[PDB]
């Protein structure tokens, strides 16, 4: 999911090792972005479920 500028920079690379290493770096960057999004989400669902559980515990107390 990297920006088109990254693709242009990869194309500009001539040596095969350079292009492959830059592609690997872009893969790692996309992996990091996806993992950050997944972590932020997962914690958000965890805490919203904990809020619904707060209400559930209030009902149990009632």
């Amino acid at each position: 999911g990297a920006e088109s500028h990254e693709l242009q920079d990869v194309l500009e690379e001539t040596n095969i090792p350079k292009r492959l290493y830059k592609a690997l770096s872009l893969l790692k960057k996309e992996f990091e972005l996806s993992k950050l999004q997944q972590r932020l989400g997962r914690e958000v669902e965890e805490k919203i479920k904990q809020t619904h559980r707060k209400y559930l515990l209030q009902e149990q107390l009632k």
Binding site: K54, Q58, L61
Partner: protein, 62 residues
């Protein structure tokens, strides 16, 4: 069984219920405020803690 982590209890609402109760203990105080505070505390406990109206209730109780 009520005794748990009770994140709701961790939000000072116990300091609105028990701490204020003990503060009121040493107060030779009439019954009108007794019923008023009991009703307000029941409303506070029956509901959540975070929202702004609960901050208003907390300041009023303080």
């Amino acid at each position: 069984i009520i005794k748990k982590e009770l994140g709701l209890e961790k939000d000072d609402k116990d300091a609105i219920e028990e701490k204020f109760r003990e503060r009121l203990k040493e107060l030779v105080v009439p019954k009108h405020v007794m019923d008023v505070v009991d009703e307000e505390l029941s409303k506070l406990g029956l509901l959540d803690n975070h929202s702004s109206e609960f901050n208003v209730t907390r300041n009023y109780l303080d």
